[PDB]
Design a protein around this motif. Structure first.
Motif, PDB file in Angstrom:
ATOM      1  N   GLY A   1       0.806  -1.207   0.000  1.00 40.32           N
ATOM      2  CA  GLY A   1       0.000   0.000   0.000  1.00 40.32           C
ATOM      3  C   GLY A   1       0.842   1.260   0.000  1.00 40.32           C
ATOM      4  N   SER A   2       0.825   1.981  -1.117  1.00 43.24           N
ATOM      5  CA  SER A   2       1.597   3.211  -1.244  1.00 43.24           C
ATOM      6  C   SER A   2       0.962   4.149  -2.266  1.00 43.24           C
ATOM      7  CB  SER A   2       3.037   2.895  -1.651  1.00 43.24           C
ATOM      8  OG  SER A   2       3.689   2.119  -0.660  1.00 43.24           O
ATOM      9  N   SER A   3       1.557   5.325  -2.432  1.00 39.42           N
ATOM     10  CA  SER A   3       1.049   6.313  -3.376  1.00 39.42           C
ATOM     11  C   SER A   3       2.168   6.834  -4.273  1.00 39.42           C
ATOM     12  CB  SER A   3       0.398   7.477  -2.626  1.00 39.42           C
ATOM     13  OG  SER A   3       1.369   8.254  -1.948  1.00 39.42           O
ATOM     14  N   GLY A   4       1.787   7.398  -5.415  1.00 35.50           N
ATOM     15  CA  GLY A   4       2.769   7.927  -6.344  1.00 35.50           C
ATOM     16  C   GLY A   4       3.345   9.252  -5.886  1.00 35.50           C
ATOM     17  N   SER A   5       3.799   9.297  -4.637  1.00 36.70           N
ATOM     18  CA  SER A   5       4.373  10.516  -4.077  1.00 36.70           C
ATOM     19  C   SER A   5       5.760  10.248  -3.501  1.00 36.70           C
ATOM     20  CB  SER A   5       3.457  11.082  -2.989  1.00 36.70           C
ATOM     21  OG  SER A   5       3.888  12.367  -2.577  1.00 36.70           O
ATOM     22  N   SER A   6       6.469  11.319  -3.159  1.00 39.89           N
ATOM     23  CA  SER A   6       7.811  11.202  -2.601  1.00 39.89           C
ATOM     24  C   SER A   6       7.773  10.530  -1.231  1.00 39.89           C
ATOM     25  CB  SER A   6       8.461  12.582  -2.486  1.00 39.89           C
ATOM     26  OG  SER A   6       9.012  12.991  -3.726  1.00 39.89           O
ATOM     27  N   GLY A   7       8.840   9.807  -0.904  1.00 37.16           N
ATOM     28  CA  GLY A   7       8.910   9.125   0.375  1.00 37.16           C
ATOM     29  C   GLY A   7       9.717   7.844   0.305  1.00 37.16           C
ATOM     30  N   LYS A   8       9.060   6.753  -0.076  1.00 37.64           N
ATOM     31  CA  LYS A   8       9.723   5.459  -0.183  1.00 37.64           C
ATOM     32  C   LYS A   8      10.799   5.486  -1.265  1.00 37.64           C
ATOM     33  CE  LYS A   8       7.035   1.790   0.550  1.00 37.64           C
ATOM     34  NZ  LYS A   8       6.079   0.699   0.210  1.00 37.64           N
ATOM     35  N   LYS A   9      10.445   6.019  -2.430  1.00 35.53           N
ATOM     36  CA  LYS A   9      11.379   6.108  -3.545  1.00 35.53           C
ATOM     37  C   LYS A   9      12.558   7.011  -3.198  1.00 35.53           C
ATOM     38  CE  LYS A   9       9.859   7.460  -7.700  1.00 35.53           C
ATOM     39  NZ  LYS A   9       8.849   8.126  -6.832  1.00 35.53           N
ATOM     40  N   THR A  10      13.615   6.932  -4.001  1.00 33.80           N
ATOM     41  CA  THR A  10      14.806   7.742  -3.779  1.00 33.80           C
ATOM     42  C   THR A  10      15.555   7.988  -5.083  1.00 33.80           C
ATOM     43  OG1 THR A  10      15.083   6.854  -1.527  1.00 33.80           O
ATOM     44  CG2 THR A  10      16.992   7.936  -2.537  1.00 33.80           C
ATOM     45  N   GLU A  11      15.590   9.246  -5.512  1.00 35.24           N
ATOM     46  CA  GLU A  11      16.274   9.613  -6.746  1.00 35.24           C
ATOM     47  C   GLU A  11      17.711  10.041  -6.465  1.00 35.24           C
ATOM     48  OE1 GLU A  11      12.723  11.043  -6.179  1.00 35.24           O
ATOM     49  OE2 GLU A  11      12.863   8.885  -6.571  1.00 35.24           O
ATOM     50  N   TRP A  12      18.643   9.519  -7.254  1.00 37.90           N
ATOM     51  CA  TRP A  12      20.055   9.847  -7.089  1.00 37.90           C
ATOM     52  C   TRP A  12      20.404  11.133  -7.828  1.00 37.90           C
ATOM     53  CZ3 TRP A  12      24.174   6.208  -5.353  1.00 37.90           C
ATOM     54  CH2 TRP A  12      23.636   5.126  -4.644  1.00 37.90           C
ATOM     55  N   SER A  13      21.573  11.689  -7.521  1.00 34.40           N
ATOM     56  CA  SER A  13      22.023  12.923  -8.154  1.00 34.40           C
ATOM     57  C   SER A  13      23.419  12.752  -8.745  1.00 34.40           C
ATOM     58  CB  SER A  13      22.021  14.071  -7.143  1.00 34.40           C
ATOM     59  OG  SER A  13      22.222  15.317  -7.786  1.00 34.40           O
ATOM     60  N   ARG A  14      23.752  13.599  -9.713  1.00 34.56           N
ATOM     61  CA  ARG A  14      25.056  13.543 -10.363  1.00 34.56           C
ATOM     62  C   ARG A  14      26.161  13.291  -9.341  1.00 34.56           C
ATOM     63  NH1 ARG A  14      28.582  12.864 -13.869  1.00 34.56           N
ATOM     64  NH2 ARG A  14      29.216  14.350 -15.499  1.00 34.56           N
ATOM     65  N   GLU A  15      26.073  13.971  -8.201  1.00 30.44           N
ATOM     66  CA  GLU A  15      27.066  13.821  -7.145  1.00 30.44           C
ATOM     67  C   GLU A  15      27.080  12.392  -6.609  1.00 30.44           C
ATOM     68  OE1 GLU A  15      25.466  17.144  -5.165  1.00 30.44           O
ATOM     69  OE2 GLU A  15      27.389  18.188  -4.949  1.00 30.44           O
ATOM     70  N   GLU A  16      25.912  11.911  -6.195  1.00 34.82           N
ATOM     71  CA  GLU A  16      25.790  10.560  -5.658  1.00 34.82           C
ATOM     72  C   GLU A  16      26.302   9.529  -6.660  1.00 34.82           C
ATOM     73  OE1 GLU A  16      21.641  10.121  -4.335  1.00 34.82           O
ATOM     74  OE2 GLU A  16      21.747  12.275  -3.914  1.00 34.82           O
ATOM     75  N   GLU A  17      26.086   9.801  -7.943  1.00 32.82           N
ATOM     76  CA  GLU A  17      26.525   8.897  -9.000  1.00 32.82           C
ATOM     77  C   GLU A  17      28.046   8.900  -9.122  1.00 32.82           C
ATOM     78  OE1 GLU A  17      24.218  10.058 -12.557  1.00 32.82           O
ATOM     79  OE2 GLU A  17      22.740  10.726 -11.074  1.00 32.82           O
ATOM     80  N   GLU A  18      28.601  10.045  -9.506  1.00 28.60           N
ATOM     81  CA  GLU A  18      30.045  10.178  -9.662  1.00 28.60           C
ATOM     82  C   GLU A  18      30.783   9.393  -8.582  1.00 28.60           C
ATOM     83  OE1 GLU A  18      31.603  11.410 -12.188  1.00 28.60           O
ATOM     84  OE2 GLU A  18      31.163  13.530 -12.568  1.00 28.60           O
ATOM     85  N   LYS A  19      30.457   9.676  -7.325  1.00 34.99           N
ATOM     86  CA  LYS A  19      31.088   8.997  -6.199  1.00 34.99           C
ATOM     87  C   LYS A  19      30.791   7.501  -6.231  1.00 34.99           C
ATOM     88  CE  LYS A  19      29.210  10.182  -2.157  1.00 34.99           C
ATOM     89  NZ  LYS A  19      28.843  11.535  -1.654  1.00 34.99           N
ATOM     90  N   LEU A  20      29.595   7.149  -6.689  1.00 36.89           N
ATOM     91  CA  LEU A  20      29.189   5.750  -6.772  1.00 36.89           C
ATOM     92  C   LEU A  20      30.106   4.971  -7.710  1.00 36.89           C
ATOM     93  CD1 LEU A  20      27.292   3.584  -5.900  1.00 36.89           C
ATOM     94  CD2 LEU A  20      25.668   4.297  -7.666  1.00 36.89           C
ATOM     95  N   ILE A  38      28.383   6.446   1.198  1.00 39.53           N
ATOM     96  CA  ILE A  38      27.719   7.277   0.201  1.00 39.53           C
ATOM     97  C   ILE A  38      26.426   7.869   0.750  1.00 39.53           C
ATOM     98  CG2 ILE A  38      26.524   7.296  -2.011  1.00 39.53           C
ATOM     99  CD1 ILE A  38      28.473   5.463  -3.151  1.00 39.53           C
ATOM    100  N   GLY A  39      25.730   7.093   1.575  1.00 41.06           N
ATOM    101  CA  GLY A  39      24.485   7.559   2.158  1.00 41.06           C
ATOM    102  C   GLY A  39      23.343   6.586   1.940  1.00 41.06           C
ATOM    103  N   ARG A  40      23.377   5.878   0.816  1.00 42.99           N
ATOM    104  CA  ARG A  40      22.335   4.912   0.489  1.00 42.99           C
ATOM    105  C   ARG A  40      22.694   3.526   1.018  1.00 42.99           C
ATOM    106  NH1 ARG A  40      22.611   9.863  -1.110  1.00 42.99           N
ATOM    107  NH2 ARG A  40      20.428  10.570  -1.176  1.00 42.99           N
ATOM    108  N   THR A  41      21.731   2.611   0.965  1.00 45.28           N
ATOM    109  CA  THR A  41      21.945   1.250   1.440  1.00 45.28           C
ATOM    110  C   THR A  41      22.703   0.421   0.410  1.00 45.28           C
ATOM    111  OG1 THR A  41      19.779   0.522   0.594  1.00 45.28           O
ATOM    112  CG2 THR A  41      19.881   1.266   2.889  1.00 45.28           C
ATOM    113  N   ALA A  42      23.263  -0.700   0.856  1.00 44.77           N
ATOM    114  CA  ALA A  42      24.013  -1.582  -0.028  1.00 44.77           C
ATOM    115  C   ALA A  42      23.209  -1.923  -1.278  1.00 44.77           C
ATOM    116  CB  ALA A  42      24.411  -2.853   0.708  1.00 44.77           C
ATOM    117  N   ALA A  43      21.974  -2.370  -1.078  1.00 42.38           N
ATOM    118  CA  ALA A  43      21.102  -2.728  -2.189  1.00 42.38           C
ATOM    119  C   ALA A  43      20.864  -1.535  -3.108  1.00 42.38           C
ATOM    120  CB  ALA A  43      19.778  -3.267  -1.668  1.00 42.38           C
TER     121      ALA A  43
END
Length: 66
Positions: A1-20, A38-43
């Protein structure tokens, strides 16, 4: 049960990527360490990272025969 709004999802940014791309390459078998580094989980890190590799290939930009 969820909605098409911000919260559960997580969008990455150029910064998060480069370092990734850097970390992932450094320790592709230490996601448990790169996650907290980095800030995000292993998965999330692995899932996103891998996705990038494919995303790049798709890019119109032709590959470099190597």
């Amino acid at each position: 049960g969820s909605s098409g709004s911000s919260g559960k999802k997580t969008e990455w940014s150029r910064e998060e990527e480069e370092k990734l791309l850097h970390l992932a390459k450094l320790m592709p078998t230490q996601w448990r360490t790169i996650a907290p580094i980095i800030g995000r989980t292993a998965a999330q890190c692995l899932e996103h990272y891998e996705f990038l590799l494919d995303k790049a290939a798709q890019r119109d930009s032709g590959p470099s025969s190597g």
